[PDB]
Amino acid sequence: RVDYIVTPINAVVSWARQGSFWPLTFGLACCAVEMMHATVSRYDFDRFGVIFRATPRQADLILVAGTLTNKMAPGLRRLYEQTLDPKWVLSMGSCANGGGYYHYSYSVVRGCNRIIPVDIYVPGCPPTAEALMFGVLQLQKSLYRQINEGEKKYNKKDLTY
Amino acid sequence: QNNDRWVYERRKSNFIAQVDYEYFKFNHWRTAWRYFRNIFLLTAGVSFLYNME
Amino acid sequence: AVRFVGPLNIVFAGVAFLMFYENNYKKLYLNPRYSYTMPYLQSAKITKNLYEKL
Amino acid sequence: MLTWISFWSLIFWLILIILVLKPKNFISILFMSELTWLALYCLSLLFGAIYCDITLLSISFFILGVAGLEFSFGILIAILYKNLNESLNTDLNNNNNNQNIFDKNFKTPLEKINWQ
Amino acid sequence: YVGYRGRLQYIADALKLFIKGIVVPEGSNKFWFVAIPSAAGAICYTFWINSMWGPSVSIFDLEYNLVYATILSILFSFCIMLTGYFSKSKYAFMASIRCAILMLNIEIFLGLLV
Amino acid sequence: RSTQLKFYDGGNRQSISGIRATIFGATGFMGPYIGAALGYIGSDVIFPHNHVYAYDDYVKELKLCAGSGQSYIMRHFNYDDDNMYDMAIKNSNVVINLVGSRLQNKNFQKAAYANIHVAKKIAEACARNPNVRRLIHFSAAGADTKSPSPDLHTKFHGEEAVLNAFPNATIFRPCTVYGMQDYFIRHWIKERDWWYHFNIVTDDCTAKRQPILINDVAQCVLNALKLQESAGQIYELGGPHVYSRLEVFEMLANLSGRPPKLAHIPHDIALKITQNFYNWEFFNMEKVIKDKLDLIVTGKHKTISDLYVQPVSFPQGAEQFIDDVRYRGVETHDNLEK
Amino acid sequence: LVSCAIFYKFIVSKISFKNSNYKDNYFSIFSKNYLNVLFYQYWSSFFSSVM
Amino acid sequence: MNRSIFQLWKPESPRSNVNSKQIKTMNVNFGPQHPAAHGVLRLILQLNGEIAERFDPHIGLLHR
Amino acid sequence: MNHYWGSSNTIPASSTQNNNYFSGGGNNVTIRGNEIMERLPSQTPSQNMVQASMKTLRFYRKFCRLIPFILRIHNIGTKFTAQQAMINFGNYIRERNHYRDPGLIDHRIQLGYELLYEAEMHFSQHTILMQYLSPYNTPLSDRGYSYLEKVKYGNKSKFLQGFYKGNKPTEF
Amino acid sequence: VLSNFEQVNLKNLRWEQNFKKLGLDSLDQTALLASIEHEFTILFPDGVFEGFENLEQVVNYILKNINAV
Amino acid sequence: NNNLYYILLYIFLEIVFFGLFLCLYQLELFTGFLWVAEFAIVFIAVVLLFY
Amino acid sequence: SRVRSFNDFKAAKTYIDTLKPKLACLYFRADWNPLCEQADKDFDKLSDTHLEYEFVKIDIDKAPQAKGYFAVRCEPEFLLLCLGQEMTRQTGQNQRNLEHRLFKVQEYVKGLNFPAGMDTYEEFHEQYMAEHTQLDKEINEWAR
Ligand SMILES: CCCCCCCCCCCCCCCCCC(=O)OC[C@H](COP(=O)([O-])OCC(O)COP(=O)([O-])OC[C@@H](COC(=O)CCCCCCCCCCCCCCCCC)OC(=O)CCCCCCCCCCCCCCCCC)OC(=O)CCCCCCCCCCCCCCCCC
Ligand SMILES: CCCCCCCCCCCCCCCCCC(=O)OC[C@H](COP(=O)([O-])OCC[N+](C)(C)C)OC(=O)CCCCCCCCCCCCCCCCC
Ligand SMILES: CCCCCCCCCCCCCCCCCC(=O)OC[C@H](COP(=O)([O-])OCC[N+](C)(C)C)OC(=O)CCCCCCCCCCCCCCCCC
Ligand SMILES: CCCCCCCCCCCCCCCCCC(=O)OC[C@H](COP(=O)([O-])OCC[N+](C)(C)C)OC(=O)CCCCCCCCCCCCCCCCC
Ligand SMILES: CCCCCCCCCCCCCCCCCC(=O)OC[C@H](COP(=O)(O)OCCN)OC(=O)CCCCCCCCCCCCCCCCC
Ligand SMILES: NC(=O)C1=CN([C@@H]2O[C@H](COP(=O)(O)OP(=O)(O)OC[C@H]3O[C@@H](n4cnc5c(N)ncnc54)[C@H](OP(=O)(O)O)[C@@H]3O)[C@@H](O)[C@H]2O)C=CC1
Ligand code: SF4
């Protein structure tokens, strides 16, 4: 059966895509600085193999770090759609999560999840650099496990069908 | 607009779709093969046979 | 006998086979063979003289 | 199938025929002129090898330099086309009717010929 | 952390680049969009022939190594320019023009050095 | 029991529609649209799924149907456990089923399982739960026991089992639905782009087709929920006009500007190859079998007019989805601006 | 070399004059004489040189 | 060093082809998702030879 | 004229020419100009409702001349025809035709020109800007409409229709 | 072009009557004239555009015009 | 072919085949000189076509 | 000659192709234009007078494909075909202008001298598709 080959290759693919996890160079608000702080030496991102890429075509993670305004929501949707699959989305900050300090505003979208599917949320205002690091590492672990979460059932011979 | 005048007055006819039953036969390539083998025989094959004999 | 390919195609195949066989035969049996030109058919021995048939 | 001498002698004039044949766009004519110079380059090298003529062999770099200078002049003229308001397709710079062009059509810059 | 003490980071990134999916823009030319990177890869993987590792330790007995290097560099610059042009991004096209200017400078600089 | 459903459709996503709906098989092409139809009025939507890969956009985008606190995704669903169905539909007064055999599946056993076992278990769970006011099962147009297609053959039995288990079940029989993520217009575009010279047909292309827009299908679902009398009846949904496969090819070619070219492969050899080789989305036996079959609205059951939905014509509906893929011929300088 | 010099002479021909015509200050007047001279001289030189 | 004023500036005269934009200028959307832009600047830039000519900044992408 | 609408802001028809060898011309009325709009001076003050009405008519004329280009670029031609969009925007203006303040009208015309420029330059999204072009009481041409409400409430007053429809969620 | 404007009856159409008689207000008139400009790929100067009072004048102007496609 | 880009591509391929003939005739040095001299010309031609 | 009326595009095209007229006059009409009422009468009156033209009538409402195939933009439409190749086209109802176009086309065809064996009838789309393959196909293959 293909599973004999698929499962080890699945593990290798998950390991490779976890090791190389390039987010998009996109910051909107104060949460950008926290992202830069994680990128810089005190909490090196590179240790976990995450390197930022400017073009969405070369990005695996969409770091929605900052407030999203109605004047920008179409742009965020276009960026998400133009990012090559497979991809994940991480909301950072109260403003990106649920509107934050500007939830009662006439210009701010009440949450980036309304425009985009958000894979993970990192609470904070601003989230600490270690908080962002924790969120990214948790996202990486979940990403590695997503390939095979025990969906297929095992038959009498222990081979998934 | 006078530069593009030709395109404005161009009459374009909608396509009619039909099933092509002989597309994979490659009749043009078959004709090329027939011509090539005829020429090859008549010149090279005859010369080679006589010279070999 | 019955043949899917035409008589002209049969003639072409025959003459092409004759060309191939005659070329190889003349290159393999009517040649000095002092130069290693056909691998696995000429010997690969180490020659101690200027002219040694391979 | 053809000896190299006859082949190159023929293809030089064939290249000239192509240059004349193709629609007169300055850039295309410039490319064809460069190809003609290179054909002369190859022919001169062939004859130099045949006749053991160092002069014929050395004509190569002379041809290269002349071709480079002519190409520089051609680039400058093609750029000058803009300031002189001339289409690179020279056939569009005159009102003569040409069946070779699908969409050649010029009118006087007017809106109505008859007022009353 | 990609491999114990980061020993397999390059392997991981290469495998990830393989895994990542690709889509060609609708407005872009489908044939050229894929043809240009293919030619660039072929030229780049031909680069190594023009290399010597000893008095005569070369895969081929090439004499005009500098000519080969210049020609291969010009071909790669061609590929970069075509990439920028056929990807209709204005930034990519400006990058291609910058590549052209760099090639113009490199011609004289490397020629004088040689 | 009572089939009445009191809900308010005058509100936006943040309103309270009054519908609590569980939508099985929402990871398909039509699943997100059907879910969004209910979600955008404030309804609560549950999406039970066991989909690989979990990180697929198909699973991910289901969260956009309703919003935060209204849309829920139930992962690792077990389709042979009754407790799982009970949990899924415990608080739902609407149960929509779109779990059908995929076009990629040629195994008769798997097709029958997907189209019968899951549907029957969902219907039984709805019968057990007294709070399930409405059940909407999605069958296929042209379903028949004598149908060569395993998908249709099993779907007929599936709808029969659903009716037997839950007599108040509403069965839809849509024709070939088209849209941005469909299997018809997108497949046409992708096949023509991958070959660049032809679309490979395996029949005379005389089979009748009656395409319907997915937006129209969603509106039909909403109207069926609004209409209490629609319960316990079978509906066939299709476009205003019927076209053959050749006519559909001609219309698409004319709309997009791409010249048509149909390359014919013998039906028998195509069937043998597809049934003896691995099958995926773009190479499957179901497509070959359904090429000859007619998938149109018959007068044997209720039609879309009964649901009071006016479907849009195929030429008008499909034009927007081929704007990007347009032949670039001779165009005006003004048109060059883009 | 002499042909290049003559081409230089034709290139350095004066183009615009300060005449007494005050009617074309705000209108574009097209004169192709400069390009015609350069074009014909260049291509005649090319043909003669290649031959 | 000689003068270069004429090579350095190009004015526009009324209804004159030579003294006019003889090229289709590049209208680029500098930002918002641009590494140089801070992230919420949508600057419509009119480049002519990669030299900025006309600026139309939009700064409402972070109005709150 | 040093303005976005100036006759010299046309897109050249060729790399080395403007549309001809004997003439100079370009299109700037039915498509966007060559150079971007760096400044949009305020409409000169109108002292009369006559001048205000003339400004409104000229703005509507420009909008009508530009609508086909807007539809083509935004891929919204299927939703409504060019004339349908013109009539819908005409209804939009009719709803505001009661204005009798020249200053307010001038401000409105400035806003309209700005939004028209945004539509030309793709600053806005098609779904966000089609709200002005959408029909007031007619279905969108790219969708199948539902006449269930009309069938149910045929020959019934709008009050009764609204009463049956409701105006508040019934769950709470 | 008028077929788009369903207020006017093309059957009994008098080419000399005013747009107001046909059933077109100023906005309808502007829309109709713009549609005619699009149809014929022409552009009416401001003076003539504002001076048009019925379809006969438009027909005469288009007949005199040579650039109409 | 009337497309300028394809014309330039075919001119480049013609240069390659001329170099191939020179290599076959054993004028390798002149092949290399021709290629280095003309690839720059083709590059400048591509830039001119972009302009 | 008498006007042959068709309601099916397939039938009309098959009849025209089978007949292979040297001079054909195709009249396309739709019910939206009131002037088609007079156009039909004008077409019928001219059909009897002109024996050198094959007069064919098509209703666009009954044959939607005909409009697209024949590139009809406004109606009523008169199309003159010489050996199945478009010679002239008239939009609107005017008997005098239609007859003048018929006269001009027939006199020019009489003056023409086609090469022997190279003047066979061709379908309406053949010339458009030839020009398309020559220009538009290459343009598309270059851009998108
Ligand atoms: C070396 C040792 C020394 C001895 C020599 C040994 C032999 C040396 C061979 C050297 C050449 C090797 C060339 C192949 C390299 C590897 C790639 C490969 O195999 O192809 C996969 C590769 C996958 O396509 P892709 O472009 O990478 O996919 C991009 C995206 O995935 C697409 O993205 P998308 O979103 O557009 O998706 C659209 C949809 C696809 O688009 C659609 O939706 C529409 C199409 C759906 C149905 C597709 C059915 C399969 C169509 C096959 C077409 C073959 C091309 C020629 C057709 C000619 C028609 C007249 O996606 C797909 O399904 C992708 C295509 C899937 C193909 C599955 C089968 C592939 C393997 C078998 C191919 C057998 C072809 C035989 C041809 C005749 C040979 C004489 O390309 C192909 O499929 C075409 C391969 C054609 C050459 C096959 C060569 C091997 C067999 C030769 C015959 C037997 C040996 C004879 C010699 C014996 C000597 C002793
Ligand atoms: C692309 C990769 C390979 C490139 C390099 C290949 C090697 C070098 C080039 C060799 C020549 C190959 C040319 C093949 C072109 C075939 C084109 C075609 O299909 O046309 C069909 C065409 C059209 O096919 P058709 O007519 O059946 O279909 C079209 C029908 N109508 C006309 C109605 C539209 O047939 C012809 O009419 C012309 C056929 C010409 C065939 C020429 C064959 C070669 C002639 C020289 C042979 C010399 C032999 C010497 C032997 C010496 C001893 C060894
Ligand atoms: C030791 C040497 C090392 C270097 C070797 C490098 C070779 C790498 C080869 C990679 C594979 C390329 C494809 C080869 C297979 C055949 C491809 C094919 O189908 O050909 C059809 C096409 C041409 O035909 P077409 O199908 O595109 O269109 C025909 C023309 N019309 C439509 C108008 C009628 O071939 C190509 O164009 C392929 C080009 C590939 C990229 C090559 C770049 C080389 C560097 C620049 C050269 C100068 C360009 C100047 C002009 C600007 C650009 C246009
Ligand atoms: C470096 C590793 C390379 C790995 C390459 C693997 C190539 C494919 C190997 C197939 C092995 C098949 C074993 C017997 C199967 C028995 C089941 C059966 O019914 O046979 C017919 C099977 C079954 O397909 P079916 O559709 O006819 O029936 C389904 C099965 N039933 C009916 C039981 C439900 O189909 C085949 O033709 C063979 C399997 C084709 C599988 C195609 C997908 C391969 C995915 C490979 C993933 C790894 C990629 C590695 C590279 C990654 C690079 C980053
Ligand atoms: C017994 C011992 C062995 C004896 C010797 C055997 C030698 C090998 C066999 C030689 C004969 C091979 C068959 C040749 C058939 C030629 C047929 C022909 O010319 O008809 C035209 C042919 C048909 O056209 P087609 O497009 O295929 O459509 C079909 C229409 N019926 O159109 C074509 O297909 C193209 C035809 C090309 C013709 C090229 C002519 C070249 C002539 C060269 C000079 C030869 C002079 C004779 C030399 C004799 C020396 C002995
Ligand atoms: N052209 C069309 O779209 C038409 C559709 N229909 C009906 O409407 C339904 C919805 O449309 P569409 O989105 O296109 O259909 P899809 O094939 O896209 O979706 C089928 C759904 O059922 C799931 N599924 C498939 N097999 C099984 C199985 N054995 N067990 C459990 N779940 C399974 C799939 O999940 P998974 O991703 O995990 O496989 C998927 O979510 C169809 O299933 C079909 O029955 C009827 C006529 C036409
Ligand atoms: S969540 Fe806080 S820190 Fe982050 S962007 Fe909003 S206000 Fe700034």
Side-chain angles (χ1 to χ4, degrees), chain A residues 28-32 34 65-67 92-96 99-102 124-127, chain H residues 64:
Chain A
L28 293 169
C30 340
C31 275
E34 291 290 335
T67 178
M92 183 185 184
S94 301
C95 282
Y101 202 2
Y102 313 90
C125 177
Chain H
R64 300 165 294 188

PDB file of all heavy atoms in Angstrom, chain A residues 28-32 34 65-67 92-96 99-102 124-127, chain H residues 64, ligand 7:
ATOM      1  N   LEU A  28       1.956  46.367  10.348  1.00  0.00           N
ATOM      2  CA  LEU A  28       0.998  47.460  10.245  1.00  0.00           C
ATOM      3  C   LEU A  28       1.060  48.462  11.385  1.00  0.00           C
ATOM      4  O   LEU A  28       0.782  49.640  11.167  1.00  0.00           O
ATOM      5  CB  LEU A  28      -0.435  46.916  10.170  1.00  0.00           C
ATOM      6  CG  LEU A  28      -0.808  46.126   8.916  1.00  0.00           C
ATOM      7  CD1 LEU A  28      -2.138  45.426   9.112  1.00  0.00           C
ATOM      8  CD2 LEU A  28      -0.854  47.047   7.707  1.00  0.00           C
ATOM      9  N   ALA A  29       1.428  48.028  12.584  1.00  0.00           N
ATOM     10  CA  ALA A  29       1.334  48.872  13.770  1.00  0.00           C
ATOM     11  C   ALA A  29       2.437  48.490  14.751  1.00  0.00           C
ATOM     12  O   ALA A  29       3.431  47.859  14.380  1.00  0.00           O
ATOM     13  CB  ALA A  29      -0.076  48.776  14.372  1.00  0.00           C
ATOM     14  N   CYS A  30       2.259  48.892  16.013  1.00  0.00           N
ATOM     15  CA  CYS A  30       3.299  48.744  17.023  1.00  0.00           C
ATOM     16  C   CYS A  30       3.739  47.303  17.166  1.00  0.00           C
ATOM     17  O   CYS A  30       4.868  47.031  17.585  1.00  0.00           O
ATOM     18  CB  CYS A  30       2.725  49.102  18.392  1.00  0.00           C
ATOM     19  SG  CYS A  30       1.206  50.107  18.384  1.00  0.00           S
ATOM     20  N   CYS A  31       2.857  46.372  16.824  1.00  0.00           N
ATOM     21  CA  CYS A  31       3.180  44.957  16.857  1.00  0.00           C
ATOM     22  C   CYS A  31       4.346  44.615  15.923  1.00  0.00           C
ATOM     23  O   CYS A  31       5.011  43.594  16.122  1.00  0.00           O
ATOM     24  CB  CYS A  31       1.884  44.220  16.523  1.00  0.00           C
ATOM     25  SG  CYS A  31       0.829  43.958  18.015  1.00  0.00           S
ATOM     26  N   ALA A  32       4.596  45.457  14.915  1.00  0.00           N
ATOM     27  CA  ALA A  32       5.730  45.292  14.000  1.00  0.00           C
ATOM     28  C   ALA A  32       7.057  45.292  14.751  1.00  0.00           C
ATOM     29  O   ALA A  32       7.944  44.475  14.477  1.00  0.00           O
ATOM     30  CB  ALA A  32       5.713  46.388  12.937  1.00  0.00           C
ATOM     31  N   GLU A  34       7.681  44.538  17.851  1.00  0.00           N
ATOM     32  CA  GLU A  34       7.800  43.298  18.615  1.00  0.00           C
ATOM     33  C   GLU A  34       8.272  42.171  17.702  1.00  0.00           C
ATOM     34  O   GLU A  34       9.076  41.323  18.106  1.00  0.00           O
ATOM     35  CB  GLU A  34       6.464  42.963  19.266  1.00  0.00           C
ATOM     36  CG  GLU A  34       6.080  43.930  20.369  1.00  0.00           C
ATOM     37  CD  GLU A  34       6.959  43.800  21.598  1.00  0.00           C
ATOM     38  OE1 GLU A  34       7.528  42.712  21.812  1.00  0.00           O
ATOM     39  OE2 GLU A  34       7.082  44.788  22.350  1.00  0.00           O
ATOM     40  N   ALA A  65       0.296  41.544  12.086  1.00  0.00           N
ATOM     41  CA  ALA A  65       0.839  42.193  13.273  1.00  0.00           C
ATOM     42  C   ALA A  65       0.485  43.672  13.199  1.00  0.00           C
ATOM     43  O   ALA A  65       1.232  44.480  12.648  1.00  0.00           O
ATOM     44  CB  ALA A  65       2.345  41.982  13.365  1.00  0.00           C
ATOM     45  N   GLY A  66      -0.663  44.018  13.765  1.00  0.00           N
ATOM     46  CA  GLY A  66      -1.111  45.390  13.777  1.00  0.00           C
ATOM     47  C   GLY A  66      -2.579  45.518  13.447  1.00  0.00           C
ATOM     48  O   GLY A  66      -3.219  44.561  13.004  1.00  0.00           O
ATOM     49  N   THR A  67      -3.119  46.709  13.661  1.00  0.00           N
ATOM     50  CA  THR A  67      -4.531  46.956  13.423  1.00  0.00           C
ATOM     51  C   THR A  67      -4.854  46.903  11.934  1.00  0.00           C
ATOM     52  O   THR A  67      -4.051  47.297  11.085  1.00  0.00           O
ATOM     53  CB  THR A  67      -4.919  48.319  13.975  1.00  0.00           C
ATOM     54  OG1 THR A  67      -6.301  48.582  13.700  1.00  0.00           O
ATOM     55  CG2 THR A  67      -4.071  49.379  13.325  1.00  0.00           C
ATOM     56  N   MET A  92      -1.467  38.778  15.586  1.00  0.00           N
ATOM     57  CA  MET A  92      -0.661  39.256  16.697  1.00  0.00           C
ATOM     58  C   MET A  92      -1.250  40.554  17.210  1.00  0.00           C
ATOM     59  O   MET A  92      -1.524  41.470  16.429  1.00  0.00           O
ATOM     60  CB  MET A  92       0.792  39.482  16.266  1.00  0.00           C
ATOM     61  CG  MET A  92       1.713  39.914  17.395  1.00  0.00           C
ATOM     62  SD  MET A  92       3.377  40.298  16.828  1.00  0.00           S
ATOM     63  CE  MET A  92       4.188  40.649  18.384  1.00  0.00           C
ATOM     64  N   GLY A  93      -1.439  40.630  18.518  1.00  0.00           N
ATOM     65  CA  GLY A  93      -1.951  41.829  19.133  1.00  0.00           C
ATOM     66  C   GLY A  93      -3.464  41.833  19.247  1.00  0.00           C
ATOM     67  O   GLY A  93      -4.183  41.154  18.517  1.00  0.00           O
ATOM     68  N   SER A  94      -3.940  42.629  20.197  1.00  0.00           N
ATOM     69  CA  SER A  94      -5.371  42.741  20.441  1.00  0.00           C
ATOM     70  C   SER A  94      -6.071  43.318  19.224  1.00  0.00           C
ATOM     71  O   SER A  94      -7.183  42.904  18.877  1.00  0.00           O
ATOM     72  CB  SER A  94      -5.644  43.605  21.671  1.00  0.00           C
ATOM     73  OG  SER A  94      -5.029  43.069  22.828  1.00  0.00           O
ATOM     74  N   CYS A  95      -5.434  44.289  18.568  1.00  0.00           N
ATOM     75  CA  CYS A  95      -6.043  44.914  17.405  1.00  0.00           C
ATOM     76  C   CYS A  95      -6.238  43.914  16.273  1.00  0.00           C
ATOM     77  O   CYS A  95      -7.291  43.896  15.625  1.00  0.00           O
ATOM     78  CB  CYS A  95      -5.087  46.002  16.916  1.00  0.00           C
ATOM     79  SG  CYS A  95      -5.047  47.556  17.808  1.00  0.00           S
ATOM     80  N   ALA A  96      -5.234  43.071  16.017  1.00  0.00           N
ATOM     81  CA  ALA A  96      -5.360  42.047  14.983  1.00  0.00           C
ATOM     82  C   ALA A  96      -6.325  40.935  15.374  1.00  0.00           C
ATOM     83  O   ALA A  96      -7.000  40.366  14.510  1.00  0.00           O
ATOM     84  CB  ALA A  96      -3.989  41.461  14.656  1.00  0.00           C
ATOM     85  N   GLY A  99      -9.977  43.559  17.248  1.00  0.00           N
ATOM     86  CA  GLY A  99     -10.147  44.990  17.193  1.00  0.00           C
ATOM     87  C   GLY A  99      -9.434  45.750  18.291  1.00  0.00           C
ATOM     88  O   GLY A  99      -9.212  46.954  18.147  1.00  0.00           O
ATOM     89  N   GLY A 100      -9.070  45.076  19.378  1.00  0.00           N
ATOM     90  CA  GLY A 100      -8.226  45.689  20.387  1.00  0.00           C
ATOM     91  C   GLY A 100      -8.804  46.981  20.918  1.00  0.00           C
ATOM     92  O   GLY A 100     -10.009  47.110  21.154  1.00  0.00           O
ATOM     93  N   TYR A 101      -7.924  47.965  21.104  1.00  0.00           N
ATOM     94  CA  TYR A 101      -8.328  49.234  21.692  1.00  0.00           C
ATOM     95  C   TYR A 101      -9.317  49.984  20.815  1.00  0.00           C
ATOM     96  O   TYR A 101     -10.014  50.876  21.308  1.00  0.00           O
ATOM     97  CB  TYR A 101      -7.089  50.099  21.932  1.00  0.00           C
ATOM     98  CG  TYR A 101      -7.239  51.179  22.983  1.00  0.00           C
ATOM     99  CD1 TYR A 101      -8.417  51.335  23.703  1.00  0.00           C
ATOM    100  CD2 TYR A 101      -6.196  52.052  23.247  1.00  0.00           C
ATOM    101  CE1 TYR A 101      -8.546  52.322  24.656  1.00  0.00           C
ATOM    102  CE2 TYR A 101      -6.316  53.040  24.196  1.00  0.00           C
ATOM    103  CZ  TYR A 101      -7.491  53.171  24.897  1.00  0.00           C
ATOM    104  OH  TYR A 101      -7.612  54.160  25.843  1.00  0.00           O
ATOM    105  N   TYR A 102      -9.397  49.640  19.531  1.00  0.00           N
ATOM    106  CA  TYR A 102     -10.234  50.346  18.572  1.00  0.00           C
ATOM    107  C   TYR A 102     -11.409  49.490  18.108  1.00  0.00           C
ATOM    108  O   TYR A 102     -11.846  49.594  16.961  1.00  0.00           O
ATOM    109  CB  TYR A 102      -9.392  50.790  17.378  1.00  0.00           C
ATOM    110  CG  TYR A 102      -8.101  51.463  17.781  1.00  0.00           C
ATOM    111  CD1 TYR A 102      -6.943  50.724  17.970  1.00  0.00           C
ATOM    112  CD2 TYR A 102      -8.045  52.835  17.988  1.00  0.00           C
ATOM    113  CE1 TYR A 102      -5.761  51.332  18.345  1.00  0.00           C
ATOM    114  CE2 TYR A 102      -6.870  53.452  18.362  1.00  0.00           C
ATOM    115  CZ  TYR A 102      -5.732  52.696  18.540  1.00  0.00           C
ATOM    116  OH  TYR A 102      -4.559  53.306  18.913  1.00  0.00           O
ATOM    117  N   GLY A 124      -2.022  39.889  23.367  1.00  0.00           N
ATOM    118  CA  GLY A 124      -1.076  40.867  23.868  1.00  0.00           C
ATOM    119  C   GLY A 124      -1.340  42.225  23.257  1.00  0.00           C
ATOM    120  O   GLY A 124      -2.050  42.371  22.267  1.00  0.00           O
ATOM    121  N   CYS A 125      -0.761  43.260  23.870  1.00  0.00           N
ATOM    122  CA  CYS A 125      -1.007  44.605  23.360  1.00  0.00           C
ATOM    123  C   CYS A 125       0.085  45.536  23.877  1.00  0.00           C
ATOM    124  O   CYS A 125      -0.173  46.355  24.769  1.00  0.00           O
ATOM    125  CB  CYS A 125      -2.376  45.173  23.712  1.00  0.00           C
ATOM    126  SG  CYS A 125      -2.500  46.881  23.072  1.00  0.00           S
ATOM    127  N   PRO A 126       1.309  45.438  23.367  1.00  0.00           N
ATOM    128  CA  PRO A 126       1.781  44.453  22.397  1.00  0.00           C
ATOM    129  C   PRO A 126       2.144  43.118  23.023  1.00  0.00           C
ATOM    130  O   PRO A 126       2.539  43.063  24.183  1.00  0.00           O
ATOM    131  CB  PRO A 126       3.037  45.117  21.808  1.00  0.00           C
ATOM    132  CG  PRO A 126       3.139  46.497  22.429  1.00  0.00           C
ATOM    133  CD  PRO A 126       2.344  46.428  23.686  1.00  0.00           C
ATOM    134  N   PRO A 127       2.018  42.022  22.282  1.00  0.00           N
ATOM    135  CA  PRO A 127       2.534  40.744  22.780  1.00  0.00           C
ATOM    136  C   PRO A 127       4.035  40.840  22.999  1.00  0.00           C
ATOM    137  O   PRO A 127       4.755  41.461  22.217  1.00  0.00           O
ATOM    138  CB  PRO A 127       2.168  39.749  21.674  1.00  0.00           C
ATOM    139  CG  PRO A 127       1.056  40.397  20.937  1.00  0.00           C
ATOM    140  CD  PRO A 127       1.323  41.863  20.995  1.00  0.00           C
TER     141      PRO A 127
ATOM    142  N   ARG H  64      -7.681  55.327  12.774  1.00  0.00           N
ATOM    143  CA  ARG H  64      -8.402  54.519  13.749  1.00  0.00           C
ATOM    144  C   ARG H  64      -9.382  55.328  14.587  1.00  0.00           C
ATOM    145  O   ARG H  64      -9.975  54.772  15.519  1.00  0.00           O
ATOM    146  CB  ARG H  64      -7.409  53.821  14.675  1.00  0.00           C
ATOM    147  CG  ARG H  64      -6.450  52.911  13.949  1.00  0.00           C
ATOM    148  CD  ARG H  64      -5.282  52.521  14.822  1.00  0.00           C
ATOM    149  NE  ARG H  64      -4.416  53.642  15.160  1.00  0.00           N
ATOM    150  CZ  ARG H  64      -3.252  53.518  15.782  1.00  0.00           C
ATOM    151  NH1 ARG H  64      -2.782  52.334  16.140  1.00  0.00           N
ATOM    152  NH2 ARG H  64      -2.537  54.609  16.042  1.00  0.00           N
TER     153      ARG H  64
HETATM  154  S1  SF4 M   7      -2.530  45.326  19.728  1.00  0.00           S
HETATM  155 FE1  SF4 M   7      -1.641  47.056  20.914  1.00  0.00          FE
HETATM  156  S2  SF4 M   7       0.568  47.033  20.330  1.00  0.00           S
HETATM  157 FE2  SF4 M   7      -0.496  45.746  18.776  1.00  0.00          FE
HETATM  158  S3  SF4 M   7      -0.982  47.204  17.095  1.00  0.00           S
HETATM  159 FE3  SF4 M   7      -2.824  47.192  18.448  1.00  0.00          FE
HETATM  160  S4  SF4 M   7      -2.449  48.923  19.881  1.00  0.00           S
HETATM  161 FE4  SF4 M   7      -0.431  48.493  18.895  1.00  0.00          FE
END
